[PDB]
Structure 1
């Protein structure tokens, strides 16, 4: 085939990037994060009690309004950090840009109020592999590959600062949003969008990951994350102060913070202070949050760093299923 499909994304506060899909006949539309760090499609169910704040303010999929729905009903569960997300399996037609695919997805009937009530999007489209799919449910991109319509079996992400919030392209990349050529790194193994990282540097010197470490390239994560211990070290080197849920610096010190570099494949990928400090002020009397957090990701996938939107904003990213690799290029804004 010779198809590419693009979907325009909205940038909410540099932490959530989401675009529209349609499910059912007629289509019920949902704003969703396209997430390389998971493998299932989830939308809230019309069966979610209105006594869940995580459902009350989002769009709900109603199977009773869709002529193309096919019942399944298998329970599926995710033991998330703040509580259980559970729902049940359903099948319907899903449109993503130009593409229409028959897809099995989860209808959520309960999920914790935090963090999900603070999502400006309604659902999640996992762009990961079947190896990590709850219930081994065939992921959406697997089903699109099977249609044999895509120009290439890749998909690409542009995240803007904050005007276009971002863009996902299915079947290729959009050269309007990057400069030069991609540089590629092979997946450690098929099944996870995760690559080797060869070190993390502050200024000119390698501080961390000296012996090597893992990097999950996670389009659904807001931040760059590392293990509690790695991040403690990094923040020490930055002179950043720990809070209960983030790290901060005195706002005036923000622009003088050193570059942080991630050695991936044959290249160093450098973020300057402007790429990782939320410069909400320049005052010595105010504290500024960093777009780098600690997260201890458990096995099998962790422990690992995760390169989320903080990283992807700077580096346009292509996820290549044909060749089991990830490519980066400098984004154009």
Structure 2
């Protein structure tokens, strides 16, 4: 492992506190794409020009055209990525990718089949897997690894900062520091937890308390810190007990509560090996109103993840927003600190 003396930041755009994306450039000349930096997976992909326009999601997002890249290197082996919430398919390709000033020859997925749900709701075009190689589908080297190979980054780590306020222009959407963290965005000290197993940014969780009565994950469980996730997710089982306590009505894809109830929901705590991470009503409630006549939605939906990774809670944006996260690849641990 060769460490240099370079740090790289990627500015992120925040769309409704549900989508955080930055921009990368694939090919020569560069073709810019809006992508999500996802610690939940390890593959890089963007919609391809070779994608049937019968997929409206491809008609609504920027496509990569290898024919216009002089650095494109063909490979073409089939590729299918199955996420807990969707699936994309296409073939492998290689080209130079630019991210935060860094330029690395990456091997990405050229998606030719992207279904409306969910990507038709995506404000971005693709995904950049920030997970380990063990999870990389097709055994393709993840992009952070290739960059770590350049022996330029000061540290074999990368941090995420998701801003609370979304739209307001003036404010910084979000930020990712490649090779370390940005102390200007957190306070107090970091606190780490070791990864249960490597290859996956998943840590052990001692319990989940709703208010005063730790009525969840009493026998401990797993929390996967998914930066490419909007909410905090748990097994349908867990979320039912959780929602019963908040008195939330179970709608099709999320839970709600009469907007006036919001300010009265108790604090929710996650005991992540060492400290107790607490969220308050405002931290997980979309208080877009205060009347009994309207519905407010919670930023904690239920979602079951297939083994060998699941079942598991996934701590996404809802959580990150309050706690600046550091992903340490060298000591295989995640550091948490109070984002400011």
For this structure pair, what is the TM-score category when the shorter chain's length is used for normalisation?
over 0.9
Partner Cα distance (2:124, 2:86) in 1? 19
Partner Cα distance (1:264, 1:78) in 2? 29
Partner Cα distance (2:124, 2:248) in 1? 31
Partner Cα distance (2:132, 2:112) in 1? 24
- Please tell me whether residue 242 in structure 1 is matched to residue 250 in structure 2: yes
- How big is the shift at 1:79? 3.9
- TM-superposition CA deviations, 1:10-46 (whole Å, max 9, x none): 0011111000001111111111000000000010001
- How big is the shift at 1:204? 2.2
Partner SS state of residue 306, structure 2 = coil
Q: Which runs of 5+ in 2 are unaligned?
A: 166-170
**Does structure 1 retain, via aligned residues, the 8 Å contact 2:190–2:336?**
yes
- How big is the shift at 1:83? 6.2
49-58 or 83-92, larger mean C-alpha shift: 83-92
Partner Cα distance (1:58, 1:83) in 2? 17
- How big is the shift at 1:296? 0.5
- How big is the shift at 1:270? 0.2
Partner SS state of residue 131, structure 1 = helix
What does residue 107 of structure 2 align with? 104
Partner SS state of residue 276, structure 2 = strand
Q: CA 1:60/1:277 → structure 2, altered by over 3 Å: closer, same or farther?
A: same
Partner SS state of residue 76, structure 2 = strand
Aligned residue pairs total 332
**Does structure 2 retain, via aligned residues, the 8 Å contact 1:221–1:309?**
yes
- TM-superposition CA deviations, 1:136-190 (whole Å, max 9, x none): 1000011111111000010000001130110000001000100011000010011
- TM-superposition CA deviations, 1:36-85 (whole Å, max 9, x none): 00000010001011121111111111101111110000000124567652
**Does structure 1 retain, via aligned residues, the 8 Å contact 2:47–2:114?**
no
Partner SS state of residue 80, structure 2 = strand
- TM-superposition CA deviations, 1:97-128 (whole Å, max 9, x none): 12110000000001211111110001100000
TM-score of the superposition, structure 1-length normalised?
0.98
**Does structure 2 retain, via aligned residues, the 8 Å contact 1:82–1:112?**
no
What does residue 177 of structure 1 align with? 185
Q: CA 1:82/1:141 → structure 2, altered by over 3 Å: closer, same or farther?
A: closer
Partner Cα distance (2:56, 2:159) in 1? 33
**Does structure 1 retain, via aligned residues, the 8 Å contact 2:72–2:94?**
yes
Alignment root-mean-square deviation, CA? 1.0
**Does structure 1 retain, via aligned residues, the 8 Å contact 2:86–2:118?**
no
Q: CA 1:84/1:164 → structure 2, altered by over 3 Å: closer, same or farther?
A: closer
- TM-superposition CA deviations, 1:280-302 (whole Å, max 9, x none): 10001111100000001000111
Partner SS state of residue 237, structure 1 = helix
Partner Cα distance (2:329, 2:81) in 1? 25
Partner Cα distance (1:223, 1:19) in 2? 19
**Does structure 1 retain, via aligned residues, the 8 Å contact 2:153–2:178?**
yes
What does residue 84 of structure 1 align with? 87
- How big is the shift at 1:205? 2.3
Q: Which runs of 5+ in 1 are unaligned?
A: none
What does residue 76 of structure 2 align with? 73
